[PDB]
Amino acid sequence: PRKIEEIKDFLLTARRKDAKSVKIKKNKDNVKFKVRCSRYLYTLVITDKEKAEKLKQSLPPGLAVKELK
Amino acid sequence: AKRTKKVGIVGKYGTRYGASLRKMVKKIEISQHAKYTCSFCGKTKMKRRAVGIWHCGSCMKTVAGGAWTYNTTSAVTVKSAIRRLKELKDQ
Amino acid sequence: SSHKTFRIKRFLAKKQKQNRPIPQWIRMKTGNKIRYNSKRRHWRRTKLGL
Amino acid sequence: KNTLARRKGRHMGIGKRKGTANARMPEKVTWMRRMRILRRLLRRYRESKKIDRHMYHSLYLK
Amino acid sequence: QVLKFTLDCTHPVEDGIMDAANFEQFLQERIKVNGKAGNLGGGVVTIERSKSKITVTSEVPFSKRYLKYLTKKYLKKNNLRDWLRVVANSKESYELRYFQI
RNA sequence: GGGCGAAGCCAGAGGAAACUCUGGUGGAGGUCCGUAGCGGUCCUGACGUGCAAAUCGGUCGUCCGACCUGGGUAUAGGGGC
RNA sequence: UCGGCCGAUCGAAAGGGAGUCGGGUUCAGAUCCCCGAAUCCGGAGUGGCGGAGAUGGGCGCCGCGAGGCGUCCAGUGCGGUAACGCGACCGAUCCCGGAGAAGCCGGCGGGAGCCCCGGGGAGAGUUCUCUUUUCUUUGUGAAGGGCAGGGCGCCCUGGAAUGGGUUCGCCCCGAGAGAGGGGCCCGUGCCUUGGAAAGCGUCGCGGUUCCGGCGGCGUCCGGUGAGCUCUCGCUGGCCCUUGAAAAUCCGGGGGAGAGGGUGUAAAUCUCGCGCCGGGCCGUACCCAUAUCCGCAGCAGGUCUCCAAGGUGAACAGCCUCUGGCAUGUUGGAACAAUGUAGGUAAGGGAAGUCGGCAAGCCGGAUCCGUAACUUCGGGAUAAGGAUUGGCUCUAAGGGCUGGGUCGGUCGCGGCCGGCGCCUAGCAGCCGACUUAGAACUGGUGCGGACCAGGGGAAUCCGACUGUUUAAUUAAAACAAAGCAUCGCGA
Ligand SMILES: [Mg+2]
Ligand SMILES: [Mg+2]
Ligand SMILES: [Mg+2]
Ligand SMILES: [Mg+2]
Ligand SMILES: [Mg+2]
Ligand SMILES: [Mg+2]
Ligand SMILES: [Mg+2]
Ligand SMILES: [Mg+2]
Ligand SMILES: [Mg+2]
Ligand SMILES: [Mg+2]
Ligand SMILES: [Mg+2]
Ligand SMILES: [Mg+2]
Ligand SMILES: [Mg+2]
Ligand SMILES: [Mg+2]
Ligand SMILES: [Mg+2]
Ligand SMILES: [Mg+2]
Ligand SMILES: [Mg+2]
Ligand SMILES: [Mg+2]
Ligand SMILES: [Mg+2]
Ligand SMILES: [Mg+2]
Ligand SMILES: [Mg+2]
Ligand SMILES: [Mg+2]
Ligand SMILES: [Mg+2]
Ligand SMILES: [Mg+2]
Ligand SMILES: [Mg+2]
Ligand SMILES: [Mg+2]
Ligand SMILES: [Mg+2]
Ligand SMILES: [Mg+2]
Ligand SMILES: [Zn+2]
Secondary structure, eight states, X not given: OEEEOSHHHHHHHXXXXXXXXXXXXXXXXXXXXXXXXXXXXXXXXXXXXXXHHHHHHTSOTTSBOOBOO | OOOOSSOGGGGGGTTOXXXXXXXXXXXXXXXXXXXXXXXXXXXXOEEEEETTEXXXXXXXXXXXOOSSSSXXXXXXXXXXXXXXXXXXXXX | OOSOOHHHHHHHHHHXXXXXXXXXXXXXXXXXXXXXXXXXXXXXXXXXXX | OHHHHHHHTTTTTTTTOOXXXXXXXXXXXXXXXXXXHHHHHHHHHHHTTSSOHHHHHHHHHO | OOOOEEEEOOHHHHHTSOOXXXXXHHHHHHXXXXXXXXXXXXXXXXXXXXXXXXXXXXXXOOOHHHHHHHHHHHHHHTTOTTTEEEEEEEXXXXXXXXXXX
């Protein structure tokens, strides 16, 4: 697994051709966006919730947006 | 305190092998395990590695020497003789 | 053992297959003269050749 | 319960000892603790300027 | 710094096999504060009842499992141990109910 | 798992020196007591149509070494070892 | 033109040898199946995408400046004094080196797992009285990133005797100590992605005759150590003993060559990502007082890994927990002789017997105290003597922090300073075991079971340790070091 640090790197990671799906896991303290690429599972950790909600609608279309809750 | 009167290093052999054989091996074992002053670096670190092989820990210089002493009295006279014959050979 | 060669495993496979009772309809054949499989082998009584 | 008694000193005695004094509390371990405690004290005294290099080195050998 | 644990005696009191008044009357002398039973350790640990709910509020480090230990001690004294059972229904709360056949 | 405590080293004391004495440290050895292991002393014990075509009980020897042991190799009959 | 594996080939399921882990699942298989996270090797000719190479200066001009045009010249990366670092970082034949690749033993130190202690939960046990009690349980794989921690015979400054640093031991230093500042390696520890969604513990609700069902809550905080077991490291000792090889992989030296004419460029790339593939054979189970060998479900034999609590020196013996079992190919009833195994015995104490055979005595630890003889090492636990319980205390043996003389002031707080003498060192907190001494006390009993040397005086033989007739002889026999002799210059 790989941990994506800032928001921008996650966007073009999710826009890759080998990105199979993105999973959103809502914990008590953070929201994790996990995109399943060919080699690695890229996880982006968002501390707050407004940025997590903003990222939810900005995801590329045609990609599975499975919610883990 | 001085722990033994006369056996010294061969106290490890106990009562075994005979007094004269222990006395004979005593002076060899002392020179075998002694640390000599290295003639290359000047440090007292030249110690026996194997039989006939003497190695210095500091300059990592390995010398071929005697079995129990760093050099034998045989080889020392030989080196002096070879030097004398070499300076006689040339002029 | 658990580690075995293919030739040994094939040998043991044949021994399993031929260690079975005769079929019941054999005894009804004309002039049978066979009562039971006399070449039955038990793993504990007699050991295999290898 | 018996461990708490042994802390206070019960069941130690002379008739409760089966091993040698060195097997119960090794002298080499006792010497290490003493050397480590005393060398640490001498070091802390040297870096707190209670003693100098030369008094430290005399006491270290002592 | 307030603990506020709770004991719920509802199923047995509605079946009349025990009363919460006596169980309250049992706790105040058995609770030990700093090892001393009686006087609730100088009244630091308080006790009160809602006729089914007995809540214990403390201002000192006080264990919830102590209430279960004390409650089980009451039930054995009153021969209720073979029918009732103290179960943690939530945090800061205990509740005693029947064995389910 | 314990015992003994070789050389090397530190401190103190006595000495003109040579050196000596005391207390520690150190941890050597085909070293000691003794497990596991390996072996097999005595009971001339048990058994002796046995549990066993050589086993069992207690007692024993050794247990850092010429130590114990698996597997792989080599040596074959007037030959091997 | 270059090209010696100078020799086929075979030889290890314990040596060498890249790279898979966590959860679930069966009646029986799983590191192989399913789920999820990785990873190694190989391939990509028509070149898969990026990134690197690699895209800057000079001069004429235009242009208010900035910036645009032409020409010329570079450009096989860059940083640090250094150790060395950064994401790549052209390069053949050839050469050099490394890794693979190294014994046994000792002593320390780091890390983990387990054990122990103090609390917080959840569930159980006891409750005749006591017991805030006793018991169970209380996760985070590989692979990445970061940080501890450990190690360095690595670098720079500097130059040390009144020598100093330093270990349990050692050991180190003008061939460069101490001190200050750096660099590298390992990082199995912690945090993080994996990750809680899983797993587990509890409490419930539905049913799909047999749900990876649904749901609530929890999965917490600390402290210890000559502890045990693995592992990593450091430093020693021993050897007339010096403790594999080869596949395989890598680095360096050298520079034959290749690449482009200033282009949105070339050769090239051990950098990031992407695409495809990994065939063959083994895999169940037993592994032993019943799956093997011994004619057998035979008290024999048969190579290893893991390893809890108490007592205790202890992997001893004895009791217990997890796990396992049914007493070893039968039961019942009696309790004769004789037996086998185990005890006790008044008085005497080897009178028994070939012979103290067998049994018994002694035994641990502490404090004393120890002879002849001797190869000076030993003898030696010589011999001999005293003590040993329980309970209540008293001393002694450690580690962490903080020691200010104060508003002269504002980042009831902070930068400098007039502002003071712990300097015979204090104050608080935490913490193991161990030793010594004392009182009291029991029907003198206390290493209370277990564990656990009888001793001395001599003679013979063999020096010792070692070995030996598997199945009647373990010896004084053999061996041994030491001594001596003999043959031999290929
Ligand atoms: Mg058989
Ligand atoms: Mg020995
Ligand atoms: Mg012995
Ligand atoms: Mg015999
Ligand atoms: Mg007999
Ligand atoms: Mg081969
Ligand atoms: Mg299985
Ligand atoms: Mg984790
Ligand atoms: Mg230095
Ligand atoms: Mg959960
Ligand atoms: Mg299997
Ligand atoms: Mg058997
Ligand atoms: Mg046979
Ligand atoms: Mg049987
Ligand atoms: Mg029986
Ligand atoms: Mg039976
Ligand atoms: Mg008698
Ligand atoms: Mg008598
Ligand atoms: Mg007689
Ligand atoms: Mg007679
Ligand atoms: Mg006897
Ligand atoms: Mg004697
Ligand atoms: Mg007493
Ligand atoms: Mg002999
Ligand atoms: Mg002799
Ligand atoms: Mg033999
Ligand atoms: Mg025999
Ligand atoms: Mg002689
Ligand atoms: Zn030298």
